[PDB]
């Protein structure tokens, strides 16, 4: 149900000073937060795909849901990232 | 430095309204998760430093969640 604790931890580590520390329960917290983020965005996308009587949630759907939900700052880097995939 | 798509997809599939997911959708979430974790962590650290600690604690995340309207969706996930 969660992304690997090790992966979460590495990303968190890169965000703080090189000598900073992170409690295990802080890492677990972030695991839980990340899963809710994914499910939160996914829920928005799934509702709108069903209403439009489409059967597939696509990358564009995720991007739109992110926009809809106030994660506007994510859209451009994600577009660029996906373009870099696909190429 | 890039996440596991299989786990991202499994998380997506928890939601009973979700039917099929395009191949690229988890890729997008992999990058999004990295951005999200970075921002959540930076914001938690503020409260860590304000409290004069060098150890990021769960309490710091809960506190960070109440200070940023973009994190409103987590209020239930990390009770203050």
């Amino acid at each position: 149900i969660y992304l690997p604790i090790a992966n979460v931890a590495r990303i968190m580590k890169n965000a703080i000073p090189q000598t900073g520390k992170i409690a295990k329960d802080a890492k677990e917290c972030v695991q839980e937060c990340v899963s809710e983020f994914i499910s939160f965005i996914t829920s928005e996308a799934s509702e709108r795909c069903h209403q439009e009587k489409r059967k597939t949630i696509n990358g564009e759907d995720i991007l739109f849901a992110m926009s809809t939900l106030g994660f506007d700052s994510y859209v451009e880097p994600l577009k660029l990232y996906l373009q870099k995939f696909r190429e | 430095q890039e996440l596991p798509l299989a786990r991202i997809k499994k998380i997506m599939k928890l939601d009973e309204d979700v039917k099929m997911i395009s191949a690229e959708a988890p890729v997008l979430f992999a990058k999004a998760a990295q951005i999200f974790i970075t921002e959540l962590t930076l914001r938690a650290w503020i409260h860590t430093e304000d409290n004069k600690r060098r150890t990021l604690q769960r309490n710091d995340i809960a506190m960070a969640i109440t200070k940023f309207d973009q994190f409103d969706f987590l209020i239930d996930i990390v009770p203050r």
Binding site: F40, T68, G70 | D15, D69, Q70, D72, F73
Partner: peptide
Amino acid sequence: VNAKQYXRILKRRXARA
């Protein structure tokens, strides 16, 4: 509230039940 998120927050809350 966060107007952009509030509907979805409550829908998620309902779902977790």
